[PDB]
Scaffold this active site. Structure first.
Site, PDB file in Angstrom:
ATOM      1  N   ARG A  78       0.874  -1.170   0.000  1.00  0.00           N
ATOM      2  CA  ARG A  78       0.000   0.000   0.000  1.00  0.00           C
ATOM      3  C   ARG A  78       0.918   1.230   0.000  1.00  0.00           C
ATOM      4  NH1 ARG A  78      -1.145   3.126   4.000  1.00  0.00           N
ATOM      5  NH2 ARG A  78      -0.684   1.659   5.709  1.00  0.00           N
ATOM      6  N   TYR A 226      -1.111  -4.613  -5.553  1.00  0.00           N
ATOM      7  CA  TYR A 226      -0.856  -5.033  -4.180  1.00  0.00           C
ATOM      8  C   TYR A 226      -1.944  -4.656  -3.199  1.00  0.00           C
ATOM      9  CZ  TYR A 226       2.217  -7.000  -0.647  1.00  0.00           C
ATOM     10  OH  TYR A 226       2.802  -7.826   0.304  1.00  0.00           O
ATOM     11  N   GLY A 227      -2.312  -5.632  -2.364  1.00  0.00           N
ATOM     12  CA  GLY A 227      -3.179  -5.466  -1.201  1.00  0.00           C
ATOM     13  C   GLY A 227      -4.024  -4.210  -1.034  1.00  0.00           C
ATOM     14  N   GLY A 228      -3.542  -3.281  -0.209  1.00  0.00           N
ATOM     15  CA  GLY A 228      -4.290  -2.073   0.103  1.00  0.00           C
ATOM     16  C   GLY A 228      -4.614  -1.185  -1.087  1.00  0.00           C
ATOM     17  N   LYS A 235      -9.249  -1.119   2.498  1.00  0.00           N
ATOM     18  CA  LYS A 235      -8.878   0.206   3.001  1.00  0.00           C
ATOM     19  C   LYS A 235      -9.681   1.296   2.316  1.00  0.00           C
ATOM     20  CE  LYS A 235      -5.759  -1.394   5.893  1.00  0.00           C
ATOM     21  NZ  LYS A 235      -6.158  -1.443   7.334  1.00  0.00           N
ATOM     22  N   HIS A 255     -10.338   1.541  12.310  1.00  0.00           N
ATOM     23  CA  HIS A 255      -9.220   0.631  12.055  1.00  0.00           C
ATOM     24  C   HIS A 255      -8.960  -0.201  13.311  1.00  0.00           C
ATOM     25  CE1 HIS A 255      -4.765   0.062  10.666  1.00  0.00           C
ATOM     26  NE2 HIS A 255      -5.542  -0.909  10.220  1.00  0.00           N
ATOM     27  N   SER A 277       1.141   0.169  12.835  1.00  0.00           N
ATOM     28  CA  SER A 277       1.925  -0.943  12.323  1.00  0.00           C
ATOM     29  C   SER A 277       2.963  -1.437  13.343  1.00  0.00           C
ATOM     30  CB  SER A 277       2.640  -0.498  11.054  1.00  0.00           C
ATOM     31  OG  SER A 277       3.157  -1.630  10.386  1.00  0.00           O
ATOM     32  N   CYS A 279       2.865  -3.573  15.793  1.00  0.00           N
ATOM     33  CA  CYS A 279       2.417  -3.769  17.167  1.00  0.00           C
ATOM     34  C   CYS A 279       1.850  -5.171  17.435  1.00  0.00           C
ATOM     35  CB  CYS A 279       1.408  -2.679  17.569  1.00  0.00           C
ATOM     36  SG  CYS A 279       2.156  -1.028  17.775  1.00  0.00           S
ATOM     37  N   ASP A 302      -8.744  -6.412  11.579  1.00  0.00           N
ATOM     38  CA  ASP A 302      -8.366  -5.154  10.920  1.00  0.00           C
ATOM     39  C   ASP A 302      -9.374  -4.007  11.018  1.00  0.00           C
ATOM     40  OD1 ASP A 302      -6.312  -3.758   9.536  1.00  0.00           O
ATOM     41  OD2 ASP A 302      -7.370  -3.902   7.671  1.00  0.00           O
ATOM     42  N   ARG A 396       2.565 -11.414   2.879  1.00  0.00           N
ATOM     43  CA  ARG A 396       1.221 -11.607   3.401  1.00  0.00           C
ATOM     44  C   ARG A 396       0.711 -13.021   3.279  1.00  0.00           C
ATOM     45  NH1 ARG A 396      -1.184  -6.767   5.968  1.00  0.00           N
ATOM     46  NH2 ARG A 396       0.317  -5.157   5.315  1.00  0.00           N
ATOM     47  N   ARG A 427       3.870   1.440  20.039  1.00  0.00           N
ATOM     48  CA  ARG A 427       5.153   0.852  20.378  1.00  0.00           C
ATOM     49  C   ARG A 427       5.988   1.993  20.936  1.00  0.00           C
ATOM     50  NH1 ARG A 427       9.154  -3.474  18.425  1.00  0.00           N
ATOM     51  NH2 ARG A 427       7.578  -4.514  17.136  1.00  0.00           N
ATOM     52  N   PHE A 513       2.742 -11.086  24.544  1.00  0.00           N
ATOM     53  CA  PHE A 513       2.139 -12.216  23.831  1.00  0.00           C
ATOM     54  C   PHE A 513       0.904 -12.716  24.577  1.00  0.00           C
ATOM     55  CE2 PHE A 513       5.137 -12.461  20.344  1.00  0.00           C
ATOM     56  CZ  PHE A 513       6.284 -11.856  20.862  1.00  0.00           C
TER      57      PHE A 513
HETATM   58  C1  LIG Z   1       5.430  -6.814  14.926  1.00  0.00           C
HETATM   59  C2  LIG Z   1       5.969  -7.870  15.886  1.00  0.00           C
HETATM   60  C3  LIG Z   1       5.303  -7.761  17.266  1.00  0.00           C
HETATM   61  C4  LIG Z   1       5.604  -8.993  18.155  1.00  0.00           C
HETATM   62  N1  LIG Z   1       4.857  -8.893  19.431  1.00  0.00           N
HETATM   63  C5  LIG Z   1       3.493  -9.086  19.504  1.00  0.00           C
HETATM   64  O1  LIG Z   1       2.876  -9.377  18.496  1.00  0.00           O
HETATM   65  N2  LIG Z   1       2.824  -8.969  20.735  1.00  0.00           N
HETATM   66  C6  LIG Z   1       1.356  -8.791  20.629  1.00  0.00           C
HETATM   67  C7  LIG Z   1       0.732 -10.140  20.896  1.00  0.00           C
HETATM   68  C8  LIG Z   1       1.315 -11.341  20.436  1.00  0.00           C
HETATM   69  C9  LIG Z   1       0.710 -12.580  20.709  1.00  0.00           C
HETATM   70  C10 LIG Z   1      -0.492 -12.621  21.431  1.00  0.00           C
HETATM   71  C11 LIG Z   1      -1.078 -11.429  21.891  1.00  0.00           C
HETATM   72  C12 LIG Z   1      -0.460 -10.197  21.624  1.00  0.00           C
HETATM   73  F1  LIG Z   1      -1.039  -9.059  22.062  1.00  0.00           F
HETATM   74  C13 LIG Z   1       3.478  -8.656  21.931  1.00  0.00           C
HETATM   75  O2  LIG Z   1       2.881  -8.568  23.008  1.00  0.00           O
HETATM   76  C14 LIG Z   1       4.853  -8.457  21.822  1.00  0.00           C
HETATM   77  N3  LIG Z   1       5.779  -8.147  22.756  1.00  0.00           N
HETATM   78  C15 LIG Z   1       6.934  -8.088  22.041  1.00  0.00           C
HETATM   79  C16 LIG Z   1       8.298  -7.772  22.594  1.00  0.00           C
HETATM   80  C17 LIG Z   1       8.955  -9.001  23.190  1.00  0.00           C
HETATM   81  C18 LIG Z   1       8.797  -9.270  24.556  1.00  0.00           C
HETATM   82  C19 LIG Z   1       9.407 -10.402  25.128  1.00  0.00           C
HETATM   83  C20 LIG Z   1      10.190 -11.275  24.345  1.00  0.00           C
HETATM   84  N4  LIG Z   1      10.830 -12.445  24.926  1.00  0.00           N
HETATM   85  C21 LIG Z   1      10.852 -12.839  26.251  1.00  0.00           C
HETATM   86  C22 LIG Z   1      11.584 -14.090  26.643  1.00  0.00           C
HETATM   87  O3  LIG Z   1      10.293 -12.203  27.138  1.00  0.00           O
HETATM   88  C23 LIG Z   1      10.359 -10.990  22.977  1.00  0.00           C
HETATM   89  C24 LIG Z   1       9.746  -9.858  22.404  1.00  0.00           C
HETATM   90  N5  LIG Z   1       6.791  -8.351  20.723  1.00  0.00           N
HETATM   91  C25 LIG Z   1       5.468  -8.581  20.614  1.00  0.00           C
HETATM   92 MN   LIG Z   2      -4.751  -2.456   8.801  1.00  0.00          MN
HETATM   93 NA    NA Z   3       2.087  -1.482   4.150  1.00  0.00          NA
END
Ligand SMILES: CCCCn1c(=O)n(Cc2ccccc2F)c(=O)c2[nH]c(Cc3ccc(NC(C)=O)cc3)nc21
Ligand SMILES: [Mn+2]
Ligand code: NA
Length: 605
Positions: A78, A226-228, A235, A255, A277, A279, A302, A396, A427, A513
């Protein structure tokens, strides 16, 4: 005369206004044939087979009905710098900024667009088939659903639209003689080709232009596949055009991912979240929660369309039919549900290919079996010592939502799902705590307005909508503010999250995560009125010991949640400057008041 060009369907079966839209643009674009899409499996299989012949797609034999498209490296994303909205008055589209050029949108006069249009579309489809895609944004037939017709010379677009929208004959039947959004797309490479063709992926980068004509209900896109840029429902339609309609008709087109979360007692809430983006938005949308007893279910990853019901609850629908997710960083660890979703019936774009016909990308976290090798997205033998990724960073998967193992039971309900919380996020390596809660609706709108995020550069992305505003951002803020005067409104609680705060060595303070279930737990109980609050100048944070840390290693909670006068002095000065500069004469007085209130609160600490 025109019926002679038709290779599937009939002109006489089409609703009159659809036929006229088709006739007008076939005459203009001069395609060799017309294919009226019916959306059937048989049609899909046929187009895939044809795209395989022409080298547009490669089969991924490791999976059930998965395919890989590799693009021209010039057409990989996009492209905002080629994206415009066309209105009589500039101010309807974007605020006139105090200094510099607006970063809130890109306006093009009606006069300039006509010239640009005439320089591109006449004869653009010569030698190609024009596909007619009838598509619905939202559940087929629903109150909040809207229908479009996309004419394209790209079979990749057709197949992608089948997944990302509800597409085909059932849509025409639901449409009847009703209104639709006119969508015109061309890759801009009429045959005979005047320029080389890279990886069998036609594009015209120099003339690439993505235009929106709200008063005409038209979306016009040239030069990118492409996509967007090309999947026009997503979008262009469901955010830009729709946000404008939303403002005019009292609803919201945002969004936002939508998920449903259930506690161990069976109580379920729906939450919406807007992130810029990088996040992990899709990851959160289908999060596998770490906390015992909790359930997370996916409505969308999305876009959300939201409208007040008769009792004043904000009801969301996901207008999409699939997920158009960033591949790199997707693994069983980071997104176990996305991995299961994409095992079948999925189109991948610009990822790497293993020698046994599987996919690969940075962060897939999957050791190769003995003797398996990787072809990169540039069709080159790939190794980790090469110093470039095996997959494009913007590569993608394009995958049916129905295939998500945790797809919510109400993900296609025509009445939508009631939103009890809105989550803004960014972020931010420094200064911004893991989670905070807005002080009021007005403060909450300001929190959305103030969003910034690390792309080594920190940039503003208000509501995560900065590339997507269908109209004046000042008016968009006024529209958000007006929700507080909707009779008996049951306004969602507003939160802000940062998964990415770091210690001084740049290590992340929060494991994130699936552990983000703990943050959702706090929001959940806050919605229910739990007295788990501690007041700060920026909003409420969790009280001491209120956040559930059971099962985690040690967390430096003090640094994670610290609010420094120094940091926030600078923050509010940056926020004020950006909003006063960019929104200028269109900045609502309620936002002016929130900027000053924050400054006053900070000055007292
Ligand atoms: C664009 C890539 C984004 C990846 N991502 C990520 O995608 N999430 C969001 C997320 C992922 C899975 C499930 C829920 C969720 F909200 C995080 O919370 C996160 N923290 C982090 C930073 C992070 C924090 C900790 C670690 N490793 C250890 C051992 O703690 C490695 C990376 N990256 C995240
Ligand atoms: Mn989006
Ligand atoms: Na993009």
């Amino acid at each position: 005369n025109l019926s002679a060009k038709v290779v599937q369907g009939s002109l006489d079966s089409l609703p009159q206004a659809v036929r006229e839209f088709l006739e007008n643009n076939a005459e203009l674009c001069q395609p060799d044939h017309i294919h009226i899409c019916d959306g059937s499996e048989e049609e899909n299989g046929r187009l895939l087979g044809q795209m395989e012949e022409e080298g547009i797609l490669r089969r991924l034999k490791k999976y059930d009905n998965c395919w890989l498209a590799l693009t021209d490296p010039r057409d990989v994303a996009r492209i905002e710098s080629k994206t415009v909205i066309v209105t009589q008055e500039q101010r309807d589209t974007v605020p006139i900024p105090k200094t510099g050029l607006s970063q809130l949108g890109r306006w093009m006069s009606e006069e300039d667009f006509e010239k640009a249009f005439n320089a591109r579309f006449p004869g653009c489809m010569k030698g190609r088939t024009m596909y007619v895609i009838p598509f619905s944004m939202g559940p087929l037939g629903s109150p909040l659903s809207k229908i479009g017709i996309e004419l394209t010379d790209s079979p990749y677009v057709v197949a992608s639209m089948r997944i990302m929208t509800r597409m085909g004959t059932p849509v025409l039947e639901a449409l009847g003689d009703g209104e639709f959004v006119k969508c015109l797309h061309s890759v801009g490479c009429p045959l005979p080709l005047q320029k080389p063709l890279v990886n069998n992926w036609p594009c015209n980068p120099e003339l690439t232009l993505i235009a929106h004509l709200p008063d005409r209900r038209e979306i016009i896109s040239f030069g990118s596949g492409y996509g967007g840029n090309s999947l026009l429902g997503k979008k262009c339609f469901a955010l830009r055009m729709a946000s404008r309609l939303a403002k005019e008709e009292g609803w919201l087109a945002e969004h936002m991912l939508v998920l449903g979360i259930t506690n161990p007692e069976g109580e379920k809430k729906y939450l919406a979240a807007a992130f810029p983006s990088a996040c992990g938005k899709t990851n959160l949308a289908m999060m596998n929660p770490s906390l015992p007893g909790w359930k997370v279910e996916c409505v969308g990853d999305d876009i959300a369309w939201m409208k007040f019901d008769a009792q004043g609850h904000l009801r969301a629908i996901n207008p999409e039919n699939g997920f158009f997710g960033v591949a790199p960083g997707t693994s069983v660890k980071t997104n176990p549900n996305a991995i299961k979703t994409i095992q079948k019936n999925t189109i991948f774009t610009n990822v790497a290919e293993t020698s046994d016909g599987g996919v690969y990308w940075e962060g897939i976290d999957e050791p190769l079996a003995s003797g398996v090798t990787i072809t990169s997205w540039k069709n080159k033998e790939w190794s980790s010592e090469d110093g470039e990724p095996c997959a494009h960073p913007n590569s993608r998967f394009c995958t049916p939502a129905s295939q998500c193992p945790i797809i919510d039971a109400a993900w296609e309900s025509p009445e939508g799902v009631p939103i009890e919380g809105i989550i803004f996020g960014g972020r931010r390596p420094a200064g911004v705590p893991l989670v905070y809660e807005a002080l009021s609706w007005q403060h909450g709108v300001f929190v959305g307005a103030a969003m910034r995020s690390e792309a080594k550069i920190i940039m503003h992305d208000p509501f995560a909508m900065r590339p997507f505003f269908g109209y004046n951002f000042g008016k968009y803020l006024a529209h958000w503010l007006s929700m507080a005067q909707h009779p008996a409104a049951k306004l969602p609680k507003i939160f802000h999250v940062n998964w990415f705060r770091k210690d001084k060595e740049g290590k992340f303070l929060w494991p994130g995560f699936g552990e983000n279930s703990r943050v959702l737990e706090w929001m959940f109980n806050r919605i229910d009125g739990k007295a788990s609050t501690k007041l700060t100048p920026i909003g409420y944070i969790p009280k001491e010991d209120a956040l559930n840390l059971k099962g985690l290693g040690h967390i430096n909670m003090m640094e994670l949640f610290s609010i420094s006068k120094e940091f926030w002095d600078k923050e509010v000065e940056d926020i004020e400057k950006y909003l006063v500069d960019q929104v200028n004469a269109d900045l609502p007085c309620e936002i002016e008041r929130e900027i000053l209130a924050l400054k006053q609160r900070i000055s007292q600490m």
